[PDB]
Amino acid sequence: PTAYALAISSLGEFNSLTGGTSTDPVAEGNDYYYRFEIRAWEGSSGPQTNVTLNVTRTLGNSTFAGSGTKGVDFEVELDPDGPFGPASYAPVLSADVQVLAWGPTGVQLRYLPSLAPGATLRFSLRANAVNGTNTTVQADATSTEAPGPYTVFETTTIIP
Amino acid sequence: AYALAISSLGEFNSLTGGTSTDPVAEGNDYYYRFEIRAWEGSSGPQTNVTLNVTRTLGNSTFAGSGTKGVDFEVELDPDGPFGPASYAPVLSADVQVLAWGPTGVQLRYLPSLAPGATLRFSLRANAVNGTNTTVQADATSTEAPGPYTVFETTTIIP
């Protein structure tokens, strides 16, 4: 018997914040973008609150870029009906995302509106590529109702 | 001289196409997808490009005895993101099944993998438990031993 559940997934790296094409490996000195989804269980008793992505760099030398400008350094898109309906991802309002932390080795982004059962959020995160060591990042999803943990690790090959 | 990369694409409700999933209800099949990606700057094609996937947490199991088109799929995008050629399934004889069991699978692409080209692997699993299933995906080639490793995690509803 389950009241609330959340899920996280890695979508890998891309050459643009939104759209564009996939990448990895990445050349040192170029920007690239990690994308992750947080997904609300369709069977949830209700909307979920304080749905938050935390990403931390665990290995390697690439750095999350900028001071945390929405539309440049990160994006958050809502698919209001998730995979259960034909509504597409669209960027959410700037006021709907709280930047709890933004720095070279980690970021934390909280979605302020409640997340309806089945709905999904896509987080896109700009990074500067650095070194011939793989960059690995730990991505964590939480809500108030579903603390998890829900954790993935995505890895990027960086060409020196 | 040579480099590889790996990425998770997350879970899907079909082997190819269909829609994304996760969470998954216990009792249902679902599919992990991973890409192995040949560095465009590589000196030449790479050999023995292998995906190894092993369960690190939870109770979901890789399904079936390892039948291509049912339990797994391997697609080649011959020019990767660098050109508009699409993914298409490779021939069965181009994929060596080094291992296939509930807790681990190993799939080797036998033709050489051209610089810039990408492979997409899809893997059927049976969902079990109210603990998250997490899998470790490793990419290797002869010329780029790595390893290159990601961890994808699935929420399973009891």
Ligand SMILES: [Ca+2]
């Ligand atoms: Ca997942």
Ligand SMILES: [Ca+2]
């Ligand atoms: Ca939708």
Ligand SMILES: [Ca+2]
């Ligand atoms: Ca990757």
Ligand SMILES: [Ca+2]
């Ligand atoms: Ca292509």
